[PDB]
Design a protein around this ligand. Structure first.
Ligand SMILES: OC[C@H]1O[C@@H]2O[C@H]3[C@H](O)[C@@H](O)[C@@H](O[C@H]4[C@H](O)[C@@H](O)[C@@H](O[C@H]5[C@H](O)[C@@H](O)[C@@H](O[C@H]6[C@H](O)[C@@H](O)[C@@H](O[C@H]7[C@H](O)[C@@H](O)[C@@H](O[C@H]8[C@H](O)[C@@H](O)[C@@H](O[C@H]1[C@H](O)[C@H]2O)O[C@@H]8CO)O[C@@H]7CO)O[C@@H]6CO)O[C@@H]5CO)O[C@@H]4CO)O[C@@H]3CO
Length: 476
């Protein structure tokens, strides 16, 4: 009797490329590509387990542009420059970026602490600020190759900075190929999402927010977004076919968000399986185990992720020692294994690139120990999405209705329902009436609405500039 364990690591970045200047206004795609997007599937080269991945199409587009040397990244241009050529504005944003990240374990260099305590910075100190910001985002693969330079910690030269940059782009250039390779080798399945990571249930029926939050105020949805919902899915299918050679049969719904209408749409578009959140299951079915494969109306398979296990990784274990965390995780899996007489399917689903920067050494001690330990347990069988979908010795249940929501509390309050977020929807509604091109789809991405109307943080205004620029461009 085995426990079937399914990791599904979700990778996404909204579009940082401002459409009038063509500049990437934030470097986060670059930094998560060099730190996470290659290295997360590259674990499969060293560990005999299965791991699965979601790549949003808008993320794939940006990885392609960086890989081809086409991305004009303003923050990265400031890193590349000789410090004598840095504008005051660029130094300021290098310092602000450092302060934003200063407390993360991946920024644990004594030299950073020295440079932040300094009133003015000379050329050598600026070179160190530039290069340490690069090295802070070093992924697992190059932490081996660049060991000598990482241990230096200070006194970097322009030549060493450029060496690091060249290696980082070599990683980005190999990234889509490793996803293709692990898929073809049967080491993992790869899914995608509707193109720009929108909330499909809201685009199909904005009144679905009242299934969970009856008291919320929403704007007057005087335009239909239903066709746009279909387009996000269809264009995702096309992009996925380009990279992987088939239409995708697995999708991750952005924010785990489902509704009866959204599930019907995924079925109509040929998606055979998706996953969503356990809170949605508990809101929809009184007596329900998350260890079963569910069939929504016998149209499409649904797995509900194990929220506690997913949250152990996403929220707890950064604060723990790696060995303690792995022993805890295996212990919980063993209790699950001993708790049912059938073979349970245990989905572990979370962002695949955001939690590691808060772990010691970018979470590499944790993941190496986790995967090493998993591959040794006879009673754990990790599965690809494809195996989880077709596995016969699993228990199964039909469900006829779900209560619309997301993996935030089972509701939509992070993206709609307060004055500020509603203003974004009103902007989008008005723009949609006058829309002339697919930039209106870019502006439907969930990310813009998440950041809007949130307590001020460094670089928040950049998401607002992006959103409004896409809205403007949509109408021209
Ligand atoms: O939009 C840019 C963003 O896009 C991607 O992220 C999206 C992701 O793909 C979706 O799945 C979804 O993610 C949900 C997530 O899975 C849930 O876990 C939850 O996330 C909440 C966190 O759990 C919770 O801890 C908290 O996070 C707070 C941090 O703990 C706190 O440290 C601080 O974080 C600041 C960062 O330290 C700083 O670096 C900067 O963050 C930038 C990112 O580093 C950068 O990569 C990018 O983010 C991408 C992301 O990588 C994609 O995968 O831009 C960020 C902004 O510049 O600034 C942070 C804020 O100051 O504060 C955070 C927030 O309070 O809250 C989060 C969010 O509630 O919910 C997610 C939403 O359901 O959505 C995300 C976003 O669209």
């Amino acid at each position: 009797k085995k426990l079937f364990l399914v990791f599904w690591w979700h990778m996404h970045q909204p579009l940082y490329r401002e459409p009038y200047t063509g500049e990437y206004l934030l470097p986060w795609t670059f930094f998560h590509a060099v730190k996470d997007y290659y290295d997360m599937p590259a674990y499969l080269k060293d560990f005999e387990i299965k791991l699965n991945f979601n790549l949003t199409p808008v993320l794939i587009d940006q990885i392609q542009e960086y890989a081809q040397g086409k991305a004009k990244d303003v923050f990265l241009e400031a890193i590349r420059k000789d410090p004598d050529d840095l504008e005051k504005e660029e130094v300021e944003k290098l310092i602000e970026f450092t302060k934003l990240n200063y407390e993360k374990p991946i920024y644990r260099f004594e030299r950073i602490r020295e440079l932040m305590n300094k009133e003015k910075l000379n050329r050598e100190e600026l070179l160190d600020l530039q290069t340490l910001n690069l090295l802070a985002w070093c992924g697992r693969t190059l932490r081996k190759d660049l060991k000598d330079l990482l241990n230096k910690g200070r006194n970097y030269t322009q030549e060493e900075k450029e060496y690091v940059l060249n290696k980082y782009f070599e990683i980005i250039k190999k990234t889509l190929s490793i996803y293709r390779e692990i898929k073809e080798e049967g080491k993992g399945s790869v899914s995608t999402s509707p193109y720009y990571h929108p909330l499909i249930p809201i685009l199909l029926n904005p009144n679905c927010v009242y299934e969970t939050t009856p008291n919320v105020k929403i704007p007057d949805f005087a335009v239909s977004f239903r066709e746009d919902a279909s387009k996000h899915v269809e264009l995702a299918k096309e992009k996925y076919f380009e990279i992987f050679g088939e239409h995708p049969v697995y999708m991750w719904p952005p924010e785990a968000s489902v509704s009866n209408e959204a599930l019907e749409l995924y079925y109509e578009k040929g998606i055979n399986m998706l996953a969503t959140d356990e809170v949605i299951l508990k809101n929809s079915v009184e007596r329900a185990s998350p260890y079963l494969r569910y069939y929504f109306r016998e149209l499409i398979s649904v797995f509900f992720r194990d929220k506690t296990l997913s949250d152990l990784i996403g929220f707890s274990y950064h604060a723990w020692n790696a060995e303690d965390a792995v022993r805890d995780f295996i212990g919980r899996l063993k209790k699950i294994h001993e708790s049912v007489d059938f073979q349970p399917v245990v989905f572990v689903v979370l962002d695949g690139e955001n939690c590691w920067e808060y772990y010691e050494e970018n979470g590499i001690p944790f993941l190496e120990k986790l995967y090493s330990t998993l591959e040794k347990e006879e009673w754990i069988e990790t599965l690809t999405l494809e195996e989880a979908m077709r596995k016969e010795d699993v228990k199964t249940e039909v469900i006829e209705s779900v209560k619309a929501g997301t993996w935030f509390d089972g509701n939509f309050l992070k993206w709609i329902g307060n004055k500020e977020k509603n203003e974004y929807w009103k902007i989008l509604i008005e723009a949609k009436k006058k829309a002339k091109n697919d930039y209106i789809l870019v502006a439907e991405g969930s990310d813009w609405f998440w950041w809007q109307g949130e307590e001020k943080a460094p670089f928040v205004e950049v998401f607002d500039k992006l959103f409004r620029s896409f809205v403007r461009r949509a109408q021209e």
